[PDB]
Amino acid sequence: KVFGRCELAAAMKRHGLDNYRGYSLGNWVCAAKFESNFNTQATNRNTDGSTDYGILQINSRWWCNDGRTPGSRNLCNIPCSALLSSDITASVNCAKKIVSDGNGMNAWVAWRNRCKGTDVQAWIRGCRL
Numbered sequence: 839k840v841f842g843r844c845e846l847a848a849a850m851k852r853h854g855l856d857n858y859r860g861y862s863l864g865n866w867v868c869a870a871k872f873e874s875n876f877n878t879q880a881t882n883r884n885t886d887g888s889t890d891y892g893i894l895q896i897n898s899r900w901w902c903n904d905g906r907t908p909g910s911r912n913l914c915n916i917p918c919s920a921l922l923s924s925d926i927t928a929s930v931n932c933a934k935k936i937v938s939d940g941n942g943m944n945a946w947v948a949w950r951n952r953c954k955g956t957d958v959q960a961w962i963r964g965c966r967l
């Protein structure tokens with residue numbers, strides 16, 4: 839599913855992401871935007887052999903099991919494929935763990951590089967929510 843911006847904001851909020859670990863919804867939306875362009879089905883192989891999955895491009899090295907990432911810890915206890923669902927629950931659940939892992943949203947390099955410090959509120963601007 840390719841979420842719309844506000845749609846995803848809403849779904850993220852619905853799933854308790856808004857201000858989760860103090861990251862406003864705009865941060866999450868922004869992260870999703872640059873991670874997956876709001877496409878729940880986004881997958882992108884990392885140079886290391888891991889793959890990132892889903893709206894938040896959760897990595898199969900640490901967070902989900904894709905069965906092909908030697909070392910996978912699967913810390914979200916989720917098949918990575920579950921991170922590709924139109925329903926973002928798994929992604930959100932796992933992102934909650936990731937963002938809790940110590941570096942906040944810097945876990946998402948694209949968040950750090952593209953969202954962090956920016957007017958992330960823009961991402962939810964106009965959204966009903």
Ligand SMILES: [Cl-]
Nearest residue numbers: 842843871876
């Ligand atoms: Cl957008």
Ligand SMILES: [Cl-]
Nearest residue numbers: 862864958959
């Ligand atoms: Cl925000």
Ligand SMILES: [Cl-]
Nearest residue numbers: 905906907910
């Ligand atoms: Cl694996």
Ligand SMILES: [Cl-]
Nearest residue numbers: 859941942943
């Ligand atoms: Cl933080």
Ligand SMILES: [Cs+]
Nearest residue numbers: 854856857858
């Ligand atoms: Cs929350």
Ligand SMILES: [Cs+]
Nearest residue numbers: 855856857858
């Ligand atoms: Cs909130």
Ligand SMILES: [Cs+]
Nearest residue numbers: 873881882883
């Ligand atoms: Cs890409």
Ligand SMILES: [Cs+]
Nearest residue numbers: 882883884885
């Ligand atoms: Cs790639």
Ligand SMILES: [Cs+]
Nearest residue numbers: 882883884890
């Ligand atoms: Cs990647």
Ligand SMILES: [Cs+]
Nearest residue numbers: 883884890947
């Ligand atoms: Cs990456």
Ligand SMILES: [Cs+]
Nearest residue numbers: 873882890895
């Ligand atoms: Cs990525």
Ligand SMILES: [Cs+]
Nearest residue numbers: 899900939945
């Ligand atoms: Cs990690």
Ligand SMILES: [Cs+]
Nearest residue numbers: 903905906910
């Ligand atoms: Cs495995």
Ligand SMILES: [Cs+]
Nearest residue numbers: 907909910911
């Ligand atoms: Cs593994």
Ligand SMILES: [Cs+]
Nearest residue numbers: 911912913915
């Ligand atoms: Cs595990």
Ligand SMILES: [Cs+]
Nearest residue numbers: 914915916931
């Ligand atoms: Cs789980």
